[PDB]
Amino acid sequence: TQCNVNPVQIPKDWITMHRSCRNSMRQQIQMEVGASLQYLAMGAHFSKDVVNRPGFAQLFFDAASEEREHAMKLIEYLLMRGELTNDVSSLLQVRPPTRSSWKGGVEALEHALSMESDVTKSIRNVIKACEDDSEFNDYHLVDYLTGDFLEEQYKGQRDLAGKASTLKKLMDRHEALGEFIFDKKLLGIDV
Amino acid sequence: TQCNVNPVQIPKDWITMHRSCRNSMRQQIQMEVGASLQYLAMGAHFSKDVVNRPGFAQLFFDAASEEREHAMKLIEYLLMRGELTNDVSSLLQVRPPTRSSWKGGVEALEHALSMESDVTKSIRNVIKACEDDSEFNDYHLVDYLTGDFLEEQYKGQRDLAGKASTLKKLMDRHEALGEFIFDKKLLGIDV
Amino acid sequence: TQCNVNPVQIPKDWITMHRSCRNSMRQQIQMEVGASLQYLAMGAHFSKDVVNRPGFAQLFFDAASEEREHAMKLIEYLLMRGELTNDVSSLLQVRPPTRSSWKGGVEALEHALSMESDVTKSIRNVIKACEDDSEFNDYHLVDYLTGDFLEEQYKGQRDLAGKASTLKKLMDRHEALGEFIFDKKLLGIDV
Amino acid sequence: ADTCYNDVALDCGITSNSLALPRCNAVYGEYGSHGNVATELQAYAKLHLERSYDYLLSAAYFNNYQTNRAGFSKLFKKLSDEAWSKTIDIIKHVTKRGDKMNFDQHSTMKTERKNYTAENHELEALAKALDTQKELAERAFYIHREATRNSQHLHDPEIAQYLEEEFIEDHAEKIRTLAGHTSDLKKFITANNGHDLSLALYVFDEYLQKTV
Amino acid sequence: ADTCYNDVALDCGITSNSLALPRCNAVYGEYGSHGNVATELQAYAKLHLERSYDYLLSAAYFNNYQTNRAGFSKLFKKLSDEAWSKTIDIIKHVTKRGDKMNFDQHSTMKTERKNYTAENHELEALAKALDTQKELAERAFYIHREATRNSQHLHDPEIAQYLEEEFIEDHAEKIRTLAGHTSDLKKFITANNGHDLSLALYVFDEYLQKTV
Amino acid sequence: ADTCYNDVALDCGITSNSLALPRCNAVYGEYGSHGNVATELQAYAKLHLERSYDYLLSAAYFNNYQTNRAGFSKLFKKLSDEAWSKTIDIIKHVTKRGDKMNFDQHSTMKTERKNYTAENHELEALAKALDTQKELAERAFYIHREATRNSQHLHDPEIAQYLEEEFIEDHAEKIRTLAGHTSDLKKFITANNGHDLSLALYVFDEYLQKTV
Ligand SMILES: [Ca+2]
Ligand SMILES: [Ca+2]
Numbered sequence A, B, C: 001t002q003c004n005v006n007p008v009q010i011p012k013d014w015i016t017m018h019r020s021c022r023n024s025m026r027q028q029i030q031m032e033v034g035a036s037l038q039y040l041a042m043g044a045h046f047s048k049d050v051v052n053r054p055g056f057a058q059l060f061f062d063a064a065s066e067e068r069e070h071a072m073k074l075i076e077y078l079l080m081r082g083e084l085t086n087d088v089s090s091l092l093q094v095r096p097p098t099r100s101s102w103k104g105g106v107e108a109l110e111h112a113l114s115m116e117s118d119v120t121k122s123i124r125n126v127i128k129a130c131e132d133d134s135e136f137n138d139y140h141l142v143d144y145l146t147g148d149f150l151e152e153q154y155k156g157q158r159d160l161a162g163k164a165s166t167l168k169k170l171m172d173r174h175e176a177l178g179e180f181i182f183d184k185k186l187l188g189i190d191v
Numbered sequence D, E, F: 001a002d003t004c005y006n007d008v009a010l011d012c013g014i015t016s017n018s019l020a021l022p023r024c025n026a027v028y029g030e031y032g033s034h035g036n037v038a039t040e041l042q043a044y045a046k047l048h049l050e051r052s053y054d055y056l057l058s059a060a061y062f063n064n065y066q067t068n069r070a071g072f073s074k075l076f077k078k079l080s081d082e083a084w085s086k087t088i089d090i091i092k093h094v095t096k097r098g099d100k101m102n103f104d105q106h107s108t109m110k111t112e113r114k115n116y117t118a119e120n121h122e123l124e125a126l127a128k129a130l131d132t133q134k135e136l137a138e139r140a141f142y143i144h145r146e147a148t149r150n151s152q153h154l155h156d157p158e159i160a161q162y163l164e165e166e167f168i169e170d171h172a173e174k175i176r177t178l179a180g181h182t183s184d185l186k187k188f189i190t191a192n193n194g195h196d197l198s199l200a201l202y203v204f205d206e207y208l209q210k211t212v
């Protein structure tokens, strides 16, 4: 039985992304998804009754959802350029994250900062691949990654670095009370 | 033990319906109930996952509730005239309807049109019995059945006949898409 | 391990209640709690399907909650005066109430009136103990018990006495209908 | 393991000349395959349908000029309207779960046969209403048990939660209300040799008009 | 099969001189006839009643001038008010189902005997609150199991749904909240040799004032 | 009987030099001690997580310029967003009950292995969505049965009510909706030799845009 419609073909000259750039974008999509899964594990850790840091839990669950949105934005960009008419199933793979426990809020913030730092470096490498391909400099995608993605990365790194510095100063003598107060401030609660 | 109050009697000259007319009304009440049950079965049929015509389902469940209201109006009329002080239990009998499946929306609409046509003929026969009894022409009930009940019948028949004509024209070449669109229009949805 | 903070001491000259007065207050607190439990049993009785007097049930559940509030007010007074830094666990004991069934609304109202009358007498005895201690006339507590607690007692007794008189007059010939109507009036329903 | 996807793959093959897709329906948890839950739910719609019309006849009887009890009539009209509405809701649930309604389906629950008569005095009418509501409530308990306990191979918590939420919670309130009404009438009849009965029935009917 | 209607027919006969109507009550599903569900529900009201007053005494203790922990006091006052309100709600449910409340009814659930003391330091008080809430929660699990699983002849999903909706869902939240509070205090006591304990208890109490 | 209060009394003694407090956690009803309910709930979060991304890829596929089915894409995007939200909700429930999430936890429920492919024609895609939703629904039935029926020593109505309220009720609606969509497509394909198929898919996609 004929369950589908015989495909039609329309002009394709407008579809211009080159392979190296497209492959770097596909790899970045998997990286964003991997980051969302690692943040979910951080949210889960701080949600435990024996850890009980709801401010940190919410911070990381929010970060997980944001990374999922980053992956979706990259996928939407490829679709807009005429890609992903096939090879969609292989774009992503969900796997358990590498780390599932942290000693305290400082370790988690430093790990998040390092993850963001890795993502920033990876995006800069996608930009290089897309800009320096000898056959096609993808001006628009390079601009999009630079003005949207890197913008979010640098602001995010500075935010995490500041949080880590502020909380770490409290650790030599005020580990419990310092983290407790900092955690409630993440929820907008001034004790 | 005396669980009830000794009945009292008040004047009864105002109670004037005659037997032939009253019996025709009792039969009409059962007919309206029978119609409500047959419409419930139509609603049930179009609600099935393998039929999936929510517009038709709602149309017929609404019709079932309307027929129940018709039965109630006839009962209220008898009560207003001083009847049903006894013989109430025997007024109605709930039984499974005769038909439970239809090939498509057209068959159901045509069956509904035929059911309505039968009800119209039956109401006209109640009118004849109530008007032509040689001992008592029940002017008021005849007027009520004519101005309220027949009014609803003729408008309803024209509505169903039009729906059947419109949908049936689509059946020789557009059975699936035609019924799908028509069904959503019944829900007020223009695709 | 040190799980608590070494206690500190502040000036205590302001803590002035004397023993006889304090002990009478502690006994009054238990009496208020006992009254709350007895009212709960009245509410439960009138809530039974075979008694079915929702107006009386609500009246007595409300009275139970009010007696609990009276106990709390006496406890708050002791705390304000600097007491109950210890001997708190022994302040109260919850035990099943003495009575759990009443013949009708009149018996329950008369029992409530008698309970209130006993509480009034007990409060007057707390006042005597607090005022007549040869070493310390507790002017403020005596004033509080007189102006707040006795005020509520006298108004409450008059209210219950009036309800009992009104309903009892209906009992020689209208036990069922009289109580039914009176019960709905307690709910603010005029039949 | 038959799945809707596999049925599509098979039938949408150039080899096929049909598109049966037997697994592409709303049936899951083997609903209707093991036990009597599916047929009992259909019979439950039928019980509500029959009772809706029984209650309607009682509402009519109490609205005749001799009885003229607007409060009792309103009580039965509400029971009728609720049972009619539940009939349609159950039919929709039966189809939501991938089954089809059969209006001649019988329950396996052994229930005595007692005709419903609409011509009754007030206490009799309330007693019958109480009995029929208890029957509706116990039938829900029966279907619930059939769905989650009686058959080793059937566990359907969707039907259980549906019954819990849409029927079971409210049955307790209705039954308690009706039981209370019979207690009130019993007292009017027995206290003071039943001397206040006629005035009490009038007052009670006025009370129903305000509270039903 | 005894029914309320049949009792009325018999007693309202000229032959009778009474009107017992034993079946005209709110009992259905044999509530109270098989198993321990009916008596356990009564004992559950009693447990809430006792705990409401235990919590009230803890609220009082934390409001004395030496402890002066308004946040801890507010936490216990809320637990007390909720348990008092539940006591009345359970009593009403017992009567709604046609039974009568007995304030001296004991539970069959084997529960150790441990007096509740109100004079405690902060960690001890939270630990006791956590234990008593877990006991209330496990008692609900026990009654639920008695209603739908332990006795072959008893299946009462009305009691099960009542417990699920009014007790069980919220118990998990309260227990998780209290467990979290004990973890926070444990850390204040152990980290950095417990040096920040007094300031931490003050800050924690202020936090409770804002969040309880 | 170990309690949090007793752990505090022991550890807060001058004799102790630690504060373990093993019983001061949110575990009650022996959650996680008997049966597979605790691990199954963790595996259920994992199933929703995996499906959220499978649905996201289907949403992307239907938004490529050749397929360009905004209605189908919206349908899958909604399924993806809901599954993502449920993943977080289940993780929070696991921790609320005193357990910890393990992202590599497997289910014991014997489920066949079938890779999810995003590149499908319309009927195939809906069929797969229907199958995966039925799998999510039957997994909830399985966990529910494990919590209240399969193990003599485990009775957890908190997990049962959570599944009933947050998953089970809505699964029936989604499955019925998807089953209806496959029936509509089946008819477009078979009636009148499938002659209206291309126009019908366009009209159906527009309908999804208005109703998803
Ligand atoms: Ca259940
Ligand atoms: Ca439930």
Ligand SMILES: [Fe+3]
Binding pocket: A032, A035, A066, A067, A070, A071, A119
């Ligand atoms: Fe990112």
Ligand SMILES: [Fe+3]
Binding pocket: B032, B035, B066, B067, B070, B071, B119
């Ligand atoms: Fe009609």
Ligand SMILES: [Fe+3]
Binding pocket: C032, C035, C066, C067, C070, C071, C119
């Ligand atoms: Fe008092």
Ligand SMILES: [Fe+3]
Binding pocket: D165, E165, F165
């Ligand atoms: Fe609910």
